[PDB]
Design a binder for these strands. Structure first.
Ligand code: SF4
Ligand code: MG
Ligand code: MG
Ligand code: MG
Ligand code: MG
Ligand code: MG
Ligand code: MG
Ligand code: MG
Ligand code: MG
Ligand code: MG
Ligand code: MG
Ligand code: MG
Ligand code: MG
Ligand code: MG
Ligand code: MG
Ligand code: MG
Ligand code: MG
Ligand code: MG
Ligand code: MG
Ligand code: MG
Ligand code: MG
Ligand code: MG
Ligand code: MG
Ligand code: MG
Ligand code: MG
Ligand code: MG
Ligand code: MG
Ligand code: MG
Ligand code: MG
Ligand code: MG
Ligand code: MG
Ligand code: MG
Ligand code: MG
Ligand code: MG
Ligand code: MG
Ligand code: MG
Ligand code: MG
Ligand code: MG
Ligand code: MG
Ligand code: MG
Ligand code: MG
Ligand code: MG
Ligand code: MG
Ligand code: MG
Ligand code: MG
Ligand code: MG
Ligand code: MG
Ligand code: MG
Ligand code: MG
Ligand code: MG
Ligand code: MG
Ligand code: MG
Ligand code: MG
Ligand code: MG
Ligand code: MG
Ligand code: MG
Ligand code: MG
Ligand code: MG
Ligand code: MG
Ligand code: MG
Ligand code: MG
Ligand code: MG
Ligand code: MG
Ligand code: MG
Ligand code: MG
Ligand code: MG
Ligand code: MG
Ligand code: MG
Ligand code: MG
Ligand code: MG
Ligand code: MG
Ligand code: MG
Ligand code: MG
Ligand code: MG
Lengths: 208, 137, 231, 148
RNA sequence: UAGCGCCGGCCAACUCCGUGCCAGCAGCCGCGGUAAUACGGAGGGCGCGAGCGUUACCCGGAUUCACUGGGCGUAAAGGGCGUGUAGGCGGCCUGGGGCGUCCCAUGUGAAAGACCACGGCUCAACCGUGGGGGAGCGUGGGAUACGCUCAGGCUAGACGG
RNA sequence: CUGGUCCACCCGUGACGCUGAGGCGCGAAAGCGUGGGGAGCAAACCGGAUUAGAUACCCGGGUAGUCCACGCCCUAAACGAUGCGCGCUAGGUCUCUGGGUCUCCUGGGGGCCGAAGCUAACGCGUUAAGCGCGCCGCCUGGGGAGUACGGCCGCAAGGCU
């Protein structure tokens, strides 16, 4: 399946902060906050000139690892968007964010997509009323996403819920809080999320 | 001689490199009809039907770019390029849909047609095609 | 001031050692030697000078370039009239393309001017006198009136461009307008402002060079009439 | 100031009795990403010397690239002795698609969208030189209609 | 349940022992002869992920059979030289025909699939619905620049006095 | 006895043209057959020397062959390692042969340096290797190999493919 292994090693090797769990990634107990150098026996050694390839290799994994998606699942969409109209970048981006799990986390239902998926994969979520244990469902504009009424009685949801009431949600997002029923408004533009990514670099990558 | 057209074109391309105020060619209504295009688009200055020791000609009056500094001050060419397309060795024929657009729109291709010589654009406007005479810029 | 009577001073020469690019500036060659169409000769004069004065009334510099034994001497005249840089002897390569380092060879000269200006130890072993003094007379031979050029010229002037294609080359690269006189043999095109006339008849050399300077002073502050002139 | 990029560096060699004394070459470009770029070639008895020397040239041999939207105006095709370079107009979503040498050269020129291809002696040196004057030969509707 | 490939360059990923042109890896250039980032093991790391690798074969890179789109002085390639059949090709001007050639209309060009839109299995893969074209050739009409054909002139190629 | 070729006059025919897979003919030397011829020279051969050896380089002899006639043989560094025709693109100096008006101008060949341009460089450059059009031959890593097989040619050695 997805990754599911040691994760901090991601942020480190990348040299950037990926808030892959939730709270700690903000805490001063973080790795990059403590050890922002490569994992393994050779982290603190002077890095050397990465290759033009190696570079383009990064941005990918960085993004790819950000959502924890199989390489394949990350070819399709970018074969999707690339064969999709207009600027392949924005589309693929919107194609990625359009995943349930993500949006679920983007809707502050869980600190990590990792949680998002599980709650998603555990069907605790719903959409337009319908229940969806499908962490790969490409949610489209006009979709009503509702927590499982059967799981509205859970406390974790509310602890993440509570820490959301008036929290700032994406322009292409709402969050009728309490009702545990958000909503997915539109497809974003690059300027809608300033990810630590240079998407074109990933374009250059599969251009091989 | 095989193809006067390329020869015509060739004569031009041969002088433009040496920067001739003009040059000559044996005459033919077709060669002229061509040349007709080649000033209305602005690559030449125009032609006049001259006449050499008894024989007709077409002294073409040549247009070039401005003097320049650097070490190579020689004036850039108007007709950067001019090469034959359809030939006696390989006659080349196009339908209106398959009519190329020279150098993204900066050049043209002279076309012989049932409705007179045209440019890559004039044909598409008139909705026809024909024997691609040449492409030039 | 262009006169016109010049016809009795140079009116061209040089055999079939000509240059094909020069024919538009020739009417014939009745004496087995090309003939310069003094008409267009004016037309360039009427065009070239229009460039000269302009630089003058603008404050730019002009560098004179003439190394023939013919024009060996006239150079130091009309130049020093105009009081501007000049290159009488050898044309030191890179004299423009490599200015920053050429020029740095004049401080050595000016410096020797300081020292040899006197004391600061004449207690230097006699071997060191004569030798520098010699090292000075050389530095002086070549640099005398290019020591004047403390920055890159806004243009230059040339007697024999084919002779000074070296000179001609470095400017053409540096975008320094190049004006000069030439006869048959030289390559026009290579010139920026042209005085197609004889390049060995001092008599004709002085004519141009002299009058050229006149439009310097005539635009460079004041006026004067006669100048030197060996018969 | 501008932005510098090192396409290549190589150690040459000269034969003298008692050994083969060396010398390094530096391929260095430089661009603002707004119409201007430069490519000199550096040589110096040691690595960083040549790089810096090159940059001095790289900024003494410039050219003005009439970009449009991130691509170029017209598809250019130039041979440098043996190396032949192909430059084609691309659209926004595209993204530069060229070898390192051209890419490195084209990228600092600001181009976001271009189709390319090296042919023949794709020696990075010559492929570069030809790459430049390919740009040194790009033109505009204005430049066109100007001459006409 | 976590397994596999890889870590000298290409090509992302490093050190330690054993060994000592031996036992070995190898797709190419090449690794090893007592300080191996190149074998083996281990630590660690890189990439995918119920997959991972290898072999085989096809296209790609191969612009290396080159119509797009290559080339023959010395790198492989001008026939030893001529004459001449078939064939390919063919200078200026006028007219007829309308073969190539071009335009429009029109019938066929089944459906499946490919491509865009959307709809059902909780997604996707899969499948359904509608939409949107062509080349190619059959039928009718038209235009005549270039190619061709039939006819009439000319003299700038050739032949001749 | 005969061919090709050039210049002038600009008299005649009026595109009659270029190229040319096949085919055909020519094809230096050596070599073959038949019949002559045979001074000089000269493969093999003998001898004398140099060498460690010297079936060679140098020397003394010397047979075919080199010469003529008629037949074959058809290869080569048969080279400009550059196919043929035409048109376009600065010139300078030398030389062959023509025509003029005789300073010089113009045609056709033979060399040289060089405009731009080409070219991987050395180099070419109105005798292109430059910009072009037509047609033929030809190349597709090295060796194996111009070998094997088959077919054709040949008296044979051997040639072509
Ligand atoms: S945010 Fe911090 S704690 Fe979280 S995965 Fe990244 S480095 Fe580790
Ligand atoms: Mg796209
Ligand atoms: Mg691809
Ligand atoms: Mg074609
Ligand atoms: Mg002179
Ligand atoms: Mg250089
Ligand atoms: Mg190659
Ligand atoms: Mg290579
Ligand atoms: Mg411009
Ligand atoms: Mg692997
Ligand atoms: Mg390995
Ligand atoms: Mg190593
Ligand atoms: Mg890989
Ligand atoms: Mg590496
Ligand atoms: Mg292994
Ligand atoms: Mg090797
Ligand atoms: Mg060891
Ligand atoms: Mg799977
Ligand atoms: Mg293959
Ligand atoms: Mg590729
Ligand atoms: Mg291809
Ligand atoms: Mg090739
Ligand atoms: Mg060879
Ligand atoms: Mg030959
Ligand atoms: Mg025939
Ligand atoms: Mg015809
Ligand atoms: Mg007709
Ligand atoms: Mg027809
Ligand atoms: Mg169908
Ligand atoms: Mg659906
Ligand atoms: Mg369908
Ligand atoms: Mg289609
Ligand atoms: Mg159809
Ligand atoms: Mg029809
Ligand atoms: Mg007709
Ligand atoms: Mg025919
Ligand atoms: Mg007729
Ligand atoms: Mg004639
Ligand atoms: Mg004749
Ligand atoms: Mg007559
Ligand atoms: Mg008649
Ligand atoms: Mg023939
Ligand atoms: Mg023979
Ligand atoms: Mg013989
Ligand atoms: Mg016998
Ligand atoms: Mg016998
Ligand atoms: Mg006998
Ligand atoms: Mg005898
Ligand atoms: Mg003997
Ligand atoms: Mg013995
Ligand atoms: Mg003996
Ligand atoms: Mg012996
Ligand atoms: Mg004897
Ligand atoms: Mg015999
Ligand atoms: Mg015998
Ligand atoms: Mg014999
Ligand atoms: Mg015999
Ligand atoms: Mg033969
Ligand atoms: Mg010879
Ligand atoms: Mg010859
Ligand atoms: Mg040969
Ligand atoms: Mg050829
Ligand atoms: Mg005579
Ligand atoms: Mg001659
Ligand atoms: Mg030469
Ligand atoms: Mg040159
Ligand atoms: Mg070429
Ligand atoms: Mg000749
Ligand atoms: Mg032939
Ligand atoms: Mg082989
Ligand atoms: Mg072989
Ligand atoms: Mg043989
Ligand atoms: Mg046999
Ligand atoms: Mg044989």
């Amino acid at each position: 399946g997805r990754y599911i292994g040691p994760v901090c090693r991601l942020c480190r090797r990348e040299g950037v902060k990926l808030y892959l769990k939730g709270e700690r990634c903000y805490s001063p107990k973080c790795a990059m906050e403590r050890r922002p150098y490569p994992p393994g026996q050779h982290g603190q050694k002077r890095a050397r000139r990465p290759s033009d390839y190696a570079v383009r290799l990064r941005e990918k994994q960085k993004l790819r690892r950000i959502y924890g998606i199989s390489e394949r699942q990350f070819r399709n969409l970018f074969e999707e968007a690339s064969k999709k109209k207009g600027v392949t970048g924005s589309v693929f981006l919107g194609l990625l964010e359009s995943r349930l799990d993500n949006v679920v986390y983007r809707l502050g239902f869980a600190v990590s997509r990792r949680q998002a998926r599980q709650l998603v994969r555990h069907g605790h979520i719903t959409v337009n009323g319908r229940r969806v244990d499908l962490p790969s469902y490409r949610v489209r504009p006009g979709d009503e996403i509702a927590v499982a009424e059967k799981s509205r009685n859970l406390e974790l949801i509310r602890q993440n819920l509570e820490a959301m009431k008036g929290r700032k949600v994406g322009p292409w997002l709402s969050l009728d809080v309490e009702g545990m029923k958000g909503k997915f408004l539109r497809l974003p533009d690059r300027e809608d999320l300033a990810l630590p990514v240079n998407e074109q670099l990933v374009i250059e990558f599969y251009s091989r | 001689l095989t193809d006067p057209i390329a020869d015509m074109l060739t004569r031009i391309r041969n002088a433009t490199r040496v920067y001739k105020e003009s040059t000559d060619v044996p005459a033919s209504r077709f060669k002229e009809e061509i040349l007709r295009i080649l000033a209305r688009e602005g690559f030449i200055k125009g032609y006049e039907r001259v006449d050499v020791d008894g024989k007709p000609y077409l002294r073409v009056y040549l247009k070039y770019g401005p003097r320049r500094q650097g070490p190579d001050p020689r004036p850039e060419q108007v007709i950067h390029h001019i090469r034959r397309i359809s030939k006696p060795g390989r006659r080349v024929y196009v339908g209106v849909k398959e009519i190329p657009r020279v150098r993204r729109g900066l050049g043209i291709a002279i076309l012989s047609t049932s409705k007179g010589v045209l440019t890559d654009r004039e044909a598409r406007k008139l909705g026809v095609g024909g024997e691609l005479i040449c492409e030039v810029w | 001031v262009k006169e016109l009577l010049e016809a009795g001073v140079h009116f061209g020469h040089e055999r079939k050692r000509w240059n094909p690019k020069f024919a538009r500036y020739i009417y014939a060659e009745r004496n087995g030697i090309h003939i310069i169409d003094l008409q267009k000769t004016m037309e360039e004069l009427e065009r070239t000078f229009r460039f000269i004065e302009d630089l003058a009334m603008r404050g730019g510099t002009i560098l004179f370039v003439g190394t023939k034994k013919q024009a060996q001497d006239i150079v130091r005249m009309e130049a020093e009239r105009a009081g501007m840089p000049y290159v009488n002897q050898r044309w030191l390569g890179g004299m423009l393309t490599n200015f920053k380092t050429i020029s740095q060879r004049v401080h050595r000269l000016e410096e020797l001017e300081a020292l040899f200006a006197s004391p600061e130890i004449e207690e230097r072993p006699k071997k060191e006198q004569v030798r520098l003094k010699h090292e000075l007379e050389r530095l002086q031979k070549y640099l005398s009136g290019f020591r004047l050029l403390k920055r890159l010229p806004d243009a230059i002037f040339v007697v024999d461009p084919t002779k000074e294609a070296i000179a001609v080359r470095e400017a053409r690269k540096l975008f320094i307008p190049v004006i000069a006189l030439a006869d048959t043999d030289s390559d026009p095109d290579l010139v920026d402002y042209i005085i197609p006339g004889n390049d060995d008849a001092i008599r004709s050399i002085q004519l141009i060079l002299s009058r050229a300077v006149d439009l310097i002073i005539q635009a460079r502050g004041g006026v004067v009439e006669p100048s030197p002139s060996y018969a | 100031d501008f932005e510098e990029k090192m396409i290549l560096i190589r150690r040459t060699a000269r034969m003298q009795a008692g050994g083969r004394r060396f010398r390094f070459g530096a391929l260095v470009v430089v661009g603002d990403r707004q119409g201007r770029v430069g490519l000199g070639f550096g040589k110096a008895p040691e690595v960083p010397l040549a790089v810096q020397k090159a940059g001095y040239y790289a900024r003494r041999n410039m050219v003005e690239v009439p970009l449009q939207n991130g691509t170029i105006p017209h598809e250019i095709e130039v041979e440098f002795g043996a190396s032949k370079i192909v430059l084609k107009p691309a659209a926004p979503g595209t993204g530069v698609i060229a070898g390192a040498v051209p890419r490195a050269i084209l990228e600092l020129a600001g181009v976001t969208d271009i189709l390319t291809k090296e042919l023949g002696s794709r020696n990075p040196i010559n492929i570069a030189y030809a790459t430049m004057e390919a740009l040194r030969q790009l033109r505009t509707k204005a430049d066109v209609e100007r001459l006409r």
